[PDB]
Amino acid sequence: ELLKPRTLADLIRILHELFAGDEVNVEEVQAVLEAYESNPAEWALYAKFDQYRYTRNLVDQGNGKFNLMILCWGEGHGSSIHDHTDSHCFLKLLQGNLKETLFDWPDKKSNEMIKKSERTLRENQCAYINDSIGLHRVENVSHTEPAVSLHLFSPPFDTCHAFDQRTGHKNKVTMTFHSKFGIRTP
């Protein structure tokens, strides 16, 4: 039974219930993430920015079932076009706006990756992707507003692939944490 999360801590408790088993009800998880009304005081601890690129800040390890993290995007910061390593990805905006651009999986032949679509993800909205749907790029295209997003990955993964938009060629990347549980992790 899905109730509105009152706070980030309440959200985390609810997520632990929703991931108690071995499968994932995507629509329920997305609904509860959307229902949490971002409260900046609750996540300030995790909102650690870097001047040069976006940062990943681990919030909860989900009793091994998921990684919950906060990503902090300076003005003009964005990601590679990437996959999600056979895992679910939920992405909820906590502050600002992000542009999500969707791409299909490349063919074997070297070719420009042409965007399938794009959308602007706004405060409190929760998007979802998995490898069956496709690839995406996420960017804070703002010149004036930093963005903050809350990401849930299940199962957790620490590697993925970045894709060269010019060719479709992929490279394995290991994702690094900027902080864990509020502690900077150089």
Binding site, annotated residues: 82, 84, 136
CA 5 to the chain's CA centroid: 19
User: And the tokens for 43?
Assistant: 């996540």
Q: Which amino acid is at 50?
A: D
What does the DSSP 8-state code read for residue 63?
G
Annotated binding site for Fe cation: 82, 84, 136
CB 154 within 8 A of CB 62: yes
User: For residues 167 and 110, is the Cβ–Cβ distance under 8 A?
Assistant: yes
Q: How far apart are CA 65 and CA 144, in angstroms?
A: 36
Strands (E), the chain: 55-60, 67-73, 81-82, 88-95, 98-103, 117-121, 126-129, 135-139, 147-154, 159-163, 170-174, 179-180, 183-184
